Amino acid sequence: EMGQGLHAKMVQVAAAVLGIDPVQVRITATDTSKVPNTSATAASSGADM
Amino acid sequence: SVGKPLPHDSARAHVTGQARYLDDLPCPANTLHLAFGLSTEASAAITGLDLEPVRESPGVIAVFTAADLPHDNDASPAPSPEPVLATGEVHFVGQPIFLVAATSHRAARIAARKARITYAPRPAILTLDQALAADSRFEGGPVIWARGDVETALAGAAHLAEGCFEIGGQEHFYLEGQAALALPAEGGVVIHCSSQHPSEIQHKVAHALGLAFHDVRVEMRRMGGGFGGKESQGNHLAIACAVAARATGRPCKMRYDRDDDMVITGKRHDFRIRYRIGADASGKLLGADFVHLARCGWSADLSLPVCDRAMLHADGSYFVPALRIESHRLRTNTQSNTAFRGFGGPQGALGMERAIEHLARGMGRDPAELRALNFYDPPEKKTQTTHYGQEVADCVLGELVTRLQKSANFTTRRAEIAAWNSTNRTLARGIALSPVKFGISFTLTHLNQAGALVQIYTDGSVALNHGGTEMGQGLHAKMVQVAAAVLGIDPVQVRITATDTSKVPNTSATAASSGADMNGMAVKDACETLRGRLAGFVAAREGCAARDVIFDAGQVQASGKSWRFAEIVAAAYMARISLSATGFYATPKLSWDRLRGQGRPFLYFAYGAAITEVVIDRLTGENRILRTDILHDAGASLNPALDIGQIEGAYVQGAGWLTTEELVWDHCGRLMTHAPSTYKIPAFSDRPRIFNVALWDQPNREETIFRSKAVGEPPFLLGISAFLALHDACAACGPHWPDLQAPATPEAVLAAVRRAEGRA
Amino acid sequence: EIVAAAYMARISLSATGFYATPKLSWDRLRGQGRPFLYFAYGAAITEVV
Amino acid sequence: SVGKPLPHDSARAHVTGQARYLDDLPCPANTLHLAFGLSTEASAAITG
Amino acid sequence: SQHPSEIQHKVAHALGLAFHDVRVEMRRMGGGFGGKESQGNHLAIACA
Amino acid sequence: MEIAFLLNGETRRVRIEDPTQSLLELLRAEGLTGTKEGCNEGDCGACTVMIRDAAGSRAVNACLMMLPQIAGKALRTIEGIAAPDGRLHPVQQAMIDHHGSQCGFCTPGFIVSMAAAHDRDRKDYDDLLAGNLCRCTGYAPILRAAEAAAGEPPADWLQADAAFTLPAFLPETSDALADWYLAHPEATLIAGGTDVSLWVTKALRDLPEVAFLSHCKDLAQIRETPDGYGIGAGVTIAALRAFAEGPHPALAGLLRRFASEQVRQVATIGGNIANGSPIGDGPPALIAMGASLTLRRGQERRRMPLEDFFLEYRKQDRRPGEFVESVTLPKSAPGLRCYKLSKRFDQDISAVCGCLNLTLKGSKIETARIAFGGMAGVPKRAAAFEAALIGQDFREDTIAAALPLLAQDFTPLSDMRASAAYRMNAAQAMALRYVRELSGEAVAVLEVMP
Amino acid sequence: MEIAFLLNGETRRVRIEDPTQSLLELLRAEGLTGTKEGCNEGDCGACTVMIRDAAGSRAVNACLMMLPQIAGKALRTIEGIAAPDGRLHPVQQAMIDHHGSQCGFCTPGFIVSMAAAHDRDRKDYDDLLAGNLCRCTGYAPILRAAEAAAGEPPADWLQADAAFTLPAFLPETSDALADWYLAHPEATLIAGGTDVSLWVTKALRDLPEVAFLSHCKDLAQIRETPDGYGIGAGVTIAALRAFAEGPHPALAGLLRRFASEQVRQVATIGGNIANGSPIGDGPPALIAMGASLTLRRGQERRRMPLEDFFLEYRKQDRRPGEFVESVTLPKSAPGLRCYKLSKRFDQDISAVCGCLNLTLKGSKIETARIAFGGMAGVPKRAAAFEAALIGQDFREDTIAAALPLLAQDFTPLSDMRASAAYRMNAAQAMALRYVRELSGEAVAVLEVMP
Numbered sequence A: 001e002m003g004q005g006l007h008a009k010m011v012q013v014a015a016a017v018l019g020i021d022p023v024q025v026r027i028t029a030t031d032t033s034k035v036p037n038t039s040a041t042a043a044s045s046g047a048d049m
Numbered sequence B: 001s002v003g004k005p006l007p008h009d010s011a012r013a014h015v016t017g018q019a020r021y022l023d024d025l026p027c028p029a030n031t032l033h034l035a036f037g038l039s040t041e042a043s044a045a046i047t048g049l050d051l052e053p054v055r056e057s058p059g060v061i062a063v064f065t066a067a068d069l070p071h072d073n074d075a076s077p078a079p080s081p082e083p084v085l086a087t088g089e090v091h092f093v094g095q096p097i098f099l100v101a102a103t104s105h106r107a108a109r110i111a112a113r114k115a116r117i118t119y120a121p122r123p124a125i126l127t128l129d130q131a132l133a134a135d136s137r138f139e140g141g142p143v144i145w146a147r148g149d150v151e152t153a154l155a156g157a158a159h160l161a162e163g164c165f166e167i168g169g170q171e172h173f174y175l176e177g178q179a180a181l182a183l184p185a186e187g188g189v190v191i192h193c194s195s196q197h198p199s200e201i202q203h204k205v206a207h208a209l210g211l212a213f214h215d216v217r218v219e220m221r222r223m224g225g226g227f228g229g230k231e232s233q234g235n236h237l238a239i240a241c242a243v244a245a246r247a248t249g250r251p252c253k254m255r256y257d258r259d260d261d262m263v264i265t266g267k268r269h270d271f272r273i274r275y276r277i278g279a280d281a282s283g284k285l286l287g288a289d290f291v292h293l294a295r296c297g298w299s300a301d302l303s304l305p306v307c308d309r310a311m312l313h314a315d316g317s318y319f320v321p322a323l324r325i326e327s328h329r330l331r332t333n334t335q336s337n338t339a340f341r342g343f344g345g346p347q348g349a350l351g352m353e354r355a356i357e358h359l360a361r362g363m364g365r366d367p368a369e370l371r372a373l374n375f376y377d378p379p380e381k382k383t384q385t386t387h388y389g390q391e392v393a394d395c396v397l398g399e400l401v402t403r404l405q406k407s408a409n410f411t412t413r414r415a416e417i418a419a420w421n422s423t424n425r426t427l428a429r430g431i432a433l434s435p436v437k438f439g440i441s442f443t444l445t446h447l448n449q450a451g452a453l454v455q456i457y458t459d460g461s462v463a464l465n466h467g468g469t470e471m472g473q474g475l476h477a478k479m480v481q482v483a484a485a486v487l488g489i490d491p492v493q494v495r496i497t498a499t500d501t502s503k504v505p506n507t508s509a510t511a512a513s514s515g516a517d518m519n520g521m522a523v524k525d526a527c528e529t530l531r532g533r534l535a536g537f538v539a540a541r542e543g544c545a546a547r548d549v550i551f552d553a554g555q556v557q558a559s560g561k562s563w564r565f566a567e568i569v570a571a572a573y574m575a576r577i578s579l580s581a582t583g584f585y586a587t588p589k590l591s592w593d594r595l596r597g598q599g600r601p602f603l604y605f606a607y608g609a610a611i612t613e614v615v616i617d618r619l620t621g622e623n624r625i626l627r628t629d630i631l632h633d634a635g636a637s638l639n640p641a642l643d644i645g646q647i648e649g650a651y652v653q654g655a656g657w658l659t660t661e662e663l664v665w666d667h668c669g670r671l672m673t674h675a676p677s678t679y680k681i682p683a684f685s686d687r688p689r690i691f692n693v694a695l696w697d698q699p700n701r702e703e704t705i706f707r708s709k710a711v712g713e714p715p716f717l718l719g720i721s722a723f724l725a726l727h728d729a730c731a732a733c734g735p736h737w738p739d740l741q742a743p744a745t746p747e748a749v750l751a752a753v754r755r756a757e758g759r760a
Numbered sequence C: 001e002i003v004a005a006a007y008m009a010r011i012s013l014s015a016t017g018f019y020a021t022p023k024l025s026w027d028r029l030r031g032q033g034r035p036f037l038y039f040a041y042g043a044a045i046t047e048v049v
Numbered sequence D: 001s002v003g004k005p006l007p008h009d010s011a012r013a014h015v016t017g018q019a020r021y022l023d024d025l026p027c028p029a030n031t032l033h034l035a036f037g038l039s040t041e042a043s044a045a046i047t048g
Numbered sequence E: 001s002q003h004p005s006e007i008q009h010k011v012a013h014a015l016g017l018a019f020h021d022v023r024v025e026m027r028r029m030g031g032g033f034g035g036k037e038s039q040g041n042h043l044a045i046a047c048a
Numbered sequence F, G: 001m002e003i004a005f006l007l008n009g010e011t012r013r014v015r016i017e018d019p020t021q022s023l024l025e026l027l028r029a030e031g032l033t034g035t036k037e038g039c040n041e042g043d044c045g046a047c048t049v050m051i052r053d054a055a056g057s058r059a060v061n062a063c064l065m066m067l068p069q070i071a072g073k074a075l076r077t078i079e080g081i082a083a084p085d086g087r088l089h090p091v092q093q094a095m096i097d098h099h100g101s102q103c104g105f106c107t108p109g110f111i112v113s114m115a116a117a118h119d120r121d122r123k124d125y126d127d128l129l130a131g132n133l134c135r136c137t138g139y140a141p142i143l144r145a146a147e148a149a150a151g152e153p154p155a156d157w158l159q160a161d162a163a164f165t166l167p168a169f170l171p172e173t174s175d176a177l178a179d180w181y182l183a184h185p186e187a188t189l190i191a192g193g194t195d196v197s198l199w200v201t202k203a204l205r206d207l208p209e210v211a212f213l214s215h216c217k218d219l220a221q222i223r224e225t226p227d228g229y230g231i232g233a234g235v236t237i238a239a240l241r242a243f244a245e246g247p248h249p250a251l252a253g254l255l256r257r258f259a260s261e262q263v264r265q266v267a268t269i270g271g272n273i274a275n276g277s278p279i280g281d282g283p284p285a286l287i288a289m290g291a292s293l294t295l296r297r298g299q300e301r302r303r304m305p306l307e308d309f310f311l312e313y314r315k316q317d318r319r320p321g322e323f324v325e326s327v328t329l330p331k332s333a334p335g336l337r338c339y340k341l342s343k344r345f346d347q348d349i350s351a352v353c354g355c356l357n358l359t360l361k362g363s364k365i366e367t368a369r370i371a372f373g374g375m376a377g378v379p380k381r382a383a384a385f386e387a388a389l390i391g392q393d394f395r396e397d398t399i400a401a402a403l404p405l406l407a408q409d410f411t412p413l414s415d416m417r418a419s420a421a422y423r424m425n426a427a428q429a430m431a432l433r434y435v436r437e438l439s440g441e442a443v444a445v446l447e448v449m450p
């Protein structure tokens, strides 16, 4: 997240796919020990992917 | 990598003093230190509470009371609540009343002592007898399970023994004491703590702060020992640091001083066990009726599952046609008792070993043959069941004890001892064999689940993470081996990460000896997913089938070519194949009904046996263990070296329990043994001088990870043989029943010697 | 309540997710292919002095 | 939830100055601080 | 940084460690615009 | 006030503002997190550290040790047991190879103990490690590791510290001490500190006006005298034990179970006496053997028989400004036999301690010195019992018939270590044990081999 | 040296040992991490904090403010913008509702400026927030937010600070100052501190012997005089702007683009003159209006015309012990017109500053005051141009013909702000501008409405 609202968008995608209110969804810090081998957030591909 | 005797994942860090435990974590300079003010009354209403002198104490920053708790005041692992700060009354000497946060651990203890409390005392219930008279208990009344008709069976029995006997509790004495640290993290908290059950800390902290579970994260990298004492007693410290940290805005740490640790936390439940047992003329048992009184303390804590487990083991290792158990769980104004290695098992089993010993002396028969005659039948129409109706299709006790008896030179050694005693009037030697049959799986069935999360980085190294917590049993080396075996690489490429609720969720406590059983399966489940992906990828690329891609020893092989695991991993990354996977496992076949006492609460049974030789001094009771020989069944062990290591340590801890460890409370309910100088665990020289331990190497019949068996708790019951041996020696001094009680301290041994001698 | 029951029934409540953008392929050196999934568009009219 | 005009996940924290950025993290008292010495030449061999 | 996995990779190499011994966390940046796709590498390497 | 000492090879100068602070806290606050706190009471060994000075090197408990005590010394903690270049010490490697740890928490203290023992090539393991508790492993794998490490050349890097150094009062001579104490009668004297540090760590007390006796070499001497041996107040229990092994094996065997090696290396006999505890193990033994005690006030010097120093529980024959300067032992006492009884054999407090010394005129009892600790508010001879014994024949039945007189000599209390009936009965049994022993019979559980 | 101030509602007393430490560092070191450091040079606003005292409340850059300056004041940071019970200030909620933040990092500073503006009900947003840069949002949504919160009762908790207070030298009077400076000629005099703090934060300098002039009420006065207005050296650019709105709108319009509101609130005219920068914006203006300057040394008191104070680049007519005490302006100058040219309009340094004052005798040019900053090592009148102008007719073409003389009056530099050619050409363009403007023609890009 660098200000572009990525985290809020993923919060919305999850709450939409599980059928629940966004307020039940909490975002956690980006961490290479939770999701590995990521690419830079860039090329405007953060939210698409 | 499975099956190899590899060292603990942290052996090198232990030995150079680099491994960190909770109080070694670096924390910010503005970190507060906390301490509880404690009740000095076993039972009383709090009438006044002057904390002014506390607030004025040097270095103090905040003081808290139940009224200050912003939401839940509840640390219990059970439906009934157990406040963290006393709510208007107190129920044992040591219940926390208020909470101080100061700029140093000393300043906190010091202020903790300066409060002026006035109480309105009430009569206190401190003994089983009192509690029985007052009908002070949990579960509104006893729990009875019956198989067949005992009274009928006992009335018509050629031989019979009646007897009663106490069994004392035990203090965990983990070398690192309870401890926690909480750091405010914008909106939520992070808790680091020393706990076998971080998901429960998560749960409890959440409820105390008013937050959804997803705002509280709990990490736990390693404990300096747990033994059950940290299955739940971690809750208080964690809740107090989080509440203190929400209030002052700063990180807060709490660690108990040994004295407080021993005064505030729980201990193995002490029991009184009444029995009647009878047998055939040939020796086959006919029936056994047991009554169990268990002292649970002021709050339920884990008494329920503990007592159930005792009931489940009242059969010891023996098939009993008729058997009844009446279990009272009595509430008293003392430390709230809790889990301890064996979790009820040993009390229940010790119950039956005493009985059967008594019976044997009664008929002038050698205890060993009586026992050998009544073990469950070997495996391979109608298989025998336990008194809760679970088929016992894996008992190898027969074969096992025979093999132990011979390697240990039992028969000859029994003769040498008789002769030797007949020439001695001041010392006496004793020797005894005791068996073990211990069921594996938590008895609250839904706890039998586990998860894992595995990651492969593009250089080929691997990060493994699972729900179990490491407290010295080698869980993390075992899981590393599993992972390295399933992915086909060398262990050194696999790194363990701290247990963390934000990585594997909803875990169960590590306990019930189910840590490796379940997390191993979860880990294997995750590695097979990854390996599936990798084979899929090598197959499509080299046009062949996936089952023909082979991972072994750090290499990958297909269609006649071969590559290093890292090259496969880099190619999968470029081909965009996910290299991250979770894993899950739920133990199958379990189902049972507590109230009726029927079903299959266990997946399988761990077995073993120990022969112990001791000597006692007929003048003072002084005594010691000369030799121990053990044969224990750990299935196809995942790591025999770590397994031998658990068996030795558990043996010493069980014998500790039934010899030098003694807890004592005074007339007012204060714990008098609350430090290592008055509570004595086995010391270096109490180790047996000859100590032989061997493993019975036969795969588990059940489908457990690599066909292994849990070896964490079962072997603690092998210590019963030490107590049985002290009893053999006493019995060698006279014709009377020694009625030796547990713990068999030197005072107790002496008393038994004298009964035997008829000297009263 | 659904989740608590799933918990009691022993159903894992944890999951990873992964996505690889499809249809892409191109050759830098020859300068030919499909390097993009789709194009974004817009327009602006600015007036200055 | 997709499609709704909802605020940034950290709006309140931004606006009250509670949001932490790297230099705001709490750290141990013994933490060192680093700084680079930079070249004053656009192109050169370093001789001493 | 906009690219924690690269930070991971570069620190590991600077330290002679397999990737699994270096963990990178990053909760928010006050602005990136591409300037932190990679120039984060120097600071991290230096701190490590 | 400033002290200096070598820390894991490096010179360190420290400004002491609180002389009472323990070594264990200073170390943890400096970040040397490898020394652990398991009890803070001397019992567990988890804080074990290694010190070294001209007498040589020894392991001690950092929680019992205050800072002023290490001045001029070289201090090694677990973080300094490995070589500078990272080589593990033989004892470290052996602990890995033999699985001498599981949880890890007792590990550093076991490693420091083991290292110090290797340094001097000592092999009596059971006694060297009594005071390092381990709840996990059952001890066997640690024995295996000590045994494999013994065949390895000593670490050179540990020996090199030998070359070192070559408010709160710190006397260098008995004279300076005597003077100063006379002026500050109310001062707190600290020797080994093993009884005093529990006033600060557990009772949470605060002691102003403090003097450390550990640096008066002259207070810590063993001198051969015309009629006995003169033992300085500052002689440690370990040193007393070493000396007794020859002329007083029975006292030596007794001191074997006095506390732990770690405590023995810094506790002093003078201190055991001045503490005045009815459960001290020293006093009974010395009384049975007929030692005497020397007090000292300025230049004055008293001198009673040891038993006369103890008046009532918590009260001694000691005058304002007067301190304990030494005790004197006969050159011999072959009748002495010391018995200690507790719940556990090693590192435990006595429920009852009985020291017996009977002199014979062939078959007849000439003299009888019989002392007990723990049977009363103060260590004391059993007069009625002694008296009825003289002139009688030394056979078991005569002792048997005198036993009830012990119930006249002592009215023992009940507590958590034992019930009064038990302590009484055990005092009696010690008597039976004594005849049986001298009469050549097997009696000691600790000498039975498997 | 101890100072006191209110911090976010709480009383605070502090031991200043380094008088040069900026308010920004003290704060972050106290854990008040909410004030951010975005440039540490006065340009970004990210460290904006709110001060209050008798004159009222204003927003200023904490990075430019050293501690001594806030003695006796009330200080409010972003963490104290909300009410004690946690209610958000109308400006905070509005920022949330209108998306006025994205990355968040400039959010505090914006909120504090916004809150200060709200407290005095100021609405000139473009000028009030000029000094808060945001790279992410485009600013639009932040304007919507300001508008939306303006219709909201001011925060009560913020005004209650009003009731408050009711090494380094801190003079209270001009006399005390004069005395002391005279004794320490070499001292470093700090007023607003807006040019000096860059010596410590960027040039990494260290200044001993320091004095703060911001507490001399008598140095910061605006006095109406028989023949003009007397402006104290310590008068802030903001205050000078407020005064000038009436009698000297042109100078007022200029000061609009002098740094930002945050810097204006503390920077002083005395300081702008004592700094002596050829790119100062004060000087050119004042010279075009023919003001005078007053120096002072003890009780002595010189008095030249402003332009004469500047000798050469980096050198002024200032004597050891001598300091600037005020400047004097005429009661009027309708001919004054001030031009600033930079890359960006707000908060930028001038490439060239043009100040023009022409008096007329109907169609004929009587007197010509023409000044420039940034055309030379010093602010100075354009003599040859001025000269050739006298007596000539006031039409565009006459001016057009004299332009070249400017290339004789100055020979401008080239640097990152602008090329010499451009500077030159611009000085000439300012001249065409002046005629065109006075002749009533549309000339200013900033006055064009969409």
Ligand SMILES: Cc1cc2nc3c(=O)[nH]c(=O)nc-3n(C[C@H](O)[C@H](O)[C@H](O)COP(=O)(O)OP(=O)(O)OC[C@H]3O[C@@H](n4cnc5c(N)ncnc54)[C@H](O)[C@@H]3O)c2cc1C
Pocket: F041, F042, F043, F188, F189, F190, F191, F192, F193, F194, F195, F196, F197, F213, F233, F257, F258, F259, F260, F263, F266, F267, F268, F269, F270, F271, F272, F273, F274, F275, F279, F280, F281, F282, F322, F323, F324, F325, F348, F349, F350
């Ligand atoms: C783990 C543990 C185990 C122990 N086990 C035993 C045991 O088995 N048996 C036993 O008998 N004791 C035991 N003790 C305590 C025993 O007395 C002390 O440990 C020791 O003998 C006291 O020695 P010290 O030099 O450390 O005395 P200190 O603590 O230094 O002081 C003891 C008291 O003596 C005073 N004092 C010291 N020197 C003099 C002087 N020469 N003149 C006058 N007053 C003086 C001090 O002021 C203080 O009042 C044990 C202690 C611990 C921690």
Ligand SMILES: Cc1cc2nc3c(=O)[nH]c(=O)nc-3n(C[C@H](O)[C@H](O)[C@H](O)COP(=O)(O)OP(=O)(O)OC[C@H]3O[C@@H](n4cnc5c(N)ncnc54)[C@H](O)[C@@H]3O)c2cc1C
Pocket: G041, G042, G043, G064, G188, G189, G190, G191, G192, G193, G194, G195, G196, G197, G213, G233, G234, G257, G258, G259, G260, G263, G266, G267, G268, G269, G270, G271, G272, G273, G274, G275, G279, G280, G281, G282, G322, G323, G324, G325, G348, G349, G350
């Ligand atoms: C972000 C930013 C934007 C700026 N924009 C502009 C701008 O657009 N135009 C412009 O002209 N300047 C600008 N400046 C600099 C400008 O000079 C200062 O902001 C200010 O006018 C000096 O006032 P001061 O009291 O803070 O000077 P100080 O920083 O206090 O220093 C004044 C200098 O003169 C000395 N001094 C101060 N008072 C006296 C006294 N009365 N007698 C003798 N010597 C004294 C000081 O010792 C120092 O040498 C800008 C600065 C910054 C931080």
Ligand SMILES: Nc1nc2c(c(=O)[nH]1)N[C@H]1C(S)=C(S)[C@@H](COP(=O)(O)O)O[C@H]1N2
Pocket: A002, A003, A004, A006, A041, A042, A043, A044, A045, A046, A047, A048, E031, E032, E033, E034, G102, G103, G136, G137
């Ligand atoms: N507020 C803010 N928005 C921003 C940036 C930023 O640094 N701050 N970086 C940009 C860049 S360079 C990219 S590549 C995209 C990344 O957004 P995405 O994650 O949705 O692809 O955000 C853009 N928007």
Ligand SMILES: Nc1nc2c(c(=O)[nH]1)N[C@H]1C(S)=C(S)[C@@H](COP(=O)(O)O)O[C@H]1N2
Pocket: B224, B225, B226, B227, B228, B340, B341, B342, B468, B471, B472, B473, B474, B475, B510, B511, B512, B513, B514, B515, B516, B517, B646, B710, B712, B713, F102, F103, F136
């Ligand atoms: N070294 C060590 N071993 C130990 C313990 C411990 O605290 N330390 N706890 C015991 C208990 S109570 C259990 S329940 C098992 C846990 O084994 P497991 O994780 O492999 O199930 O550890 C047993 N062995």
Ligand code: MOS
Pocket: B196, B227, B228, B229, B231, B339, B340, B341, B342, B343, B510, B511, B512, B513, B713
């Ligand atoms: O004893 Mo293990 O169930 S914690």
Ligand code: MOS
Pocket: A041, A042, A043, A044, E002, E033, E034, E035, E037
């Ligand atoms: O510039 Mo965006 O590709 S980081």
Ligand code: FES
Pocket: F036, F037, F038, F039, F040, F041, F042, F043, F044, F045, F046, F047, F048, F061, F062, F063, F064
């Ligand atoms: S901490 Fe236990 S002996 Fe020092």
Ligand code: FES
Pocket: B175, B224, B225, B472, F100, F101, F102, F103, F104, F105, F106, F107, F133, F134, F135, F136, F137
């Ligand atoms: S290894 Fe755990 S205490 Fe010894």
Ligand code: FES
Pocket: G036, G037, G038, G039, G040, G041, G042, G043, G044, G045, G046, G047, G048, G061, G062, G063, G064
């Ligand atoms: S940090 Fe940018 S103005 Fe202060």
Ligand code: FES
Pocket: A003, E030, E031, G100, G101, G102, G103, G104, G105, G106, G107, G133, G134, G135, G136, G137
């Ligand atoms: S929101 Fe990123 S700078 Fe304003």
Ligand SMILES: [Ca+2]
Pocket: B171, B172, B173, B229, B261, B262, B265, B266, B267
């Ligand atoms: Ca406990």
